[PDB]
């Protein structure tokens, strides 16, 4: 209810670049100033022969509003042999997935392809660039000797990423092992230290990962979307992973132990093709010190009293109890074909009432399918099913694709330094990104 | 001596890959115990492969048919 939607900070990129596809905040531990990170996966770079390589832009905030590219990669395609390219950066979608912790920026390119040494091919392995301090290294955990569809060749590593409070990188690669999906977790120190630009396949010592399973798990896309939080009381963030096409396309969410990857919990959807697990989030929504799990299901159809089914979207909210048990309730969308629940973004305690709040988007709702973001407040009994605030998209589609306001969101970072965390919302269909700041809340 | 090698075929081309591998194995080992299954999960198993032959066929597959998961178990 306290977001300022009257005077928001609006940023834009080159037309056709999908600027605003993915957003995050950049907050160095002691720079005094903060930047917004806005991806533009189809942007035209200055690289020697790269078309629509994609880029990540570091957007300022105080004073004026300008965006500039980060030179994570200032070169083109390296050769393997004379007239035989090693890698293909054109149309790699760099900036499609971006996350940052302190001065560490992890920017990924899920459609990056390369040949491997064993044979000449073009496999969508996916790579990430990790920048910290004054050094940049390439992180590519799916770029290895285990190649092609049965291996990590089609991993698309970096599709979904996050950070663990233990200074570990959590990376989801939904295409591994014929799309069973894989989670990979490693240490920042290992990633930065064990770096050699002449080595394409790098092994790390403290890496954890999931493994290939039976064909009955094929095309499940595990690691489609990831999140972290403590689900066993060991003080170590565990791993939450959406698996949207699992269990006869009911969709599932898996929780793995953050120290040794042993499986801890399993959530299963109710309706086929609701695509349950599209997006997940882990946060304490009721003040119990136990992380709770939020699972989106954007294609869910809500059957009415006459038997008619309306596609509205659904979000499942489960509270963690000390026993390890979960208490689950359901929240349905409000508009037909708006796809409510496609994007879930914890805001932290948006209104400073002691309970965390969460934003849930419905990117194709509202007038002319501009897109709507719903703000839901928390409480001691779990999430309040009635939204407190409605954020509407402000732009018309220019070339078929809806602005898709609310497609990608990030909160829980306070940029204007007032104690109330702000929210950045992408609208890539019109190459825009908009920052909504949270107002102080006065109780009388 | 003797080992067991299993090939797991997945994807839209699983049956084409199965045929390509099966035909290769039949030519390399006309009298190998080659068993195939096309029920739900598609796979090929060769039993009694003469140990070194397990690596010889795995290498051929890796360099030819794109992505077949091969498991070798030797005593
Ligand atoms: C949340 O939900 C997930 C699934 O959605 C669940 O994970 C799955 O757990 C099962 C185990 O319950 C995994 O299935 C197998 O587990 C065995 C471990 O041993 C148990 O099962 C055997 C069965 O005979 C018992 O004898 C034994 O006592 C135990 O009970 C593994 O050994 C299996 O490994 C296979 O792959 C290996 C790869 O190297 C092979 O070497 C091995 O031989 C197995 O191959 C199988 O398939 C082959 C196909 O050709 C076949 O030829 C072989 O003969 C054999 O049948 C295997 O892992 C299952 O994989 C897990 N799936 C996923 C996605 O993780 C979580 O546990 C659950 N979590 C919670 C909290 O509920
Ligand atoms: C990036 O540059 C490419 C090449 O200049 C642009 O692609 C061209 O777009 C025009 C639009 O009228 C087409 O007629 C050409 O045929 C396209 N060429 C190729 C090779 O695709 C692309 O649109 C630019 N993208 C961005 C975001 O600026
Ligand atoms: C992971 O660590 C926990 C610690 O309590 C232990 O109980 C569990 O058995 C371990 N699992 C594996 C696979 O090592
Ligand atoms: C509609 O008709 C059914 C009987 O088929 C009845 O039980 C129901 O109460 C009616 N609903 C309304 C709103 O009249
Ligand atoms: Ca833990
Ligand atoms: Ca809780
Ligand atoms: Ca609150
Ligand atoms: Ca603020
Ligand atoms: Ca297909
Ligand atoms: Mg087919």
Numbering used by the authors:
A (entry chain A): 1 to 444
B (entry chain C): 1 to 75
Report text from the authors:
The highly homologous integrins αvβ6 and αvβ8 bind to latent transforming growth factor-β1 and β3 (L-TGF-β1 and L-TGF-β3) leading to release of active TGF-β1 and -β31–3.
As expected based on the negative stain class averages, the αvβ8 - B8_BP_dslf was found to be exclusively in the extended-closed conformation. The cryoEM model of αvβ8 - B8_BP_dslf complex is also very close to the computational design model (complex RMSD 0.7 Å). Y172 of the β8-SDL2 loops bends inward to form a hydrophobic patch similar to the conformation in L-TGF-β-bound structures. For the LXX(L/I) motif, B8_BP_dslf has the sequence MAVY which packs against SDL2 of αvβ8; in L-TGF-β1 the corresponding sequence is LATI. The cryoEM structure reveals the molecular basis for Y in the fourth position of the LXX(L/I) motif: we find that Y16 forms stabilizing interactions with A115 of the β8 subunit and interacts with the less bulky L174 in the β8-SDL2 loop.
